[PDB]
Amino acid sequence: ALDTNYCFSSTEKNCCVRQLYIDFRKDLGWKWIHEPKGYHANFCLGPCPYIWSLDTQYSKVLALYNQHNPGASAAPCCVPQALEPLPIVYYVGRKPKVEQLSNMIVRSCKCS
């Protein structure tokens, strides 16, 4: 529900997972990661109309409100929900440590 399987396969303006490449050195500033030089992380973007994948009840109550008060600076935000790891390789001295970076990529999003 609102994962890459859907968002990448279909097309729409509402909250959904979007494409977003990231170079570690240039965008994050990190210089310690040996591999990869970057990765695909994606990100959540798009309005959250009423009843469009609203996480909890407060999510709906907030949408309803907004719907009745158009432009009220108060509504659900399109944020991540399922995050995945990222296999990396960095050097500690001479022996390269190969480990996984947790919650680095996004699988799905949700309005809340």
């Binding site: 040996h34 960095y90 050097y91 500690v92």
Partner: protein
Amino acid sequence: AVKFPQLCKFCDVRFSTCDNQKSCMSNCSITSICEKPQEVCVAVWRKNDENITLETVCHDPKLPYHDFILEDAASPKCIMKEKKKPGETFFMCSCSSDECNDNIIFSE
């Protein structure tokens, strides 16, 4: 307070092409976190007769590398302070700044 290990180039001894220049660029494709938090970066430029070799590693300042006291091991930059060694030229710098041994110096 905590004292964290910094990043240094760590390709050991590789064939180089750096010569007769005000400054060269190590170009080690390996940036590592020094095991020992006290360690610093090092750069050894040993030109034998025809071949030249550059050495980039992490090293504890409290020790002598190739029989030399790391006196410049507190500098943020890596200025090659030439030494005297038989049958070859020998420059050696050491600094304390993330990837400071990636850009060796003899100029300005």
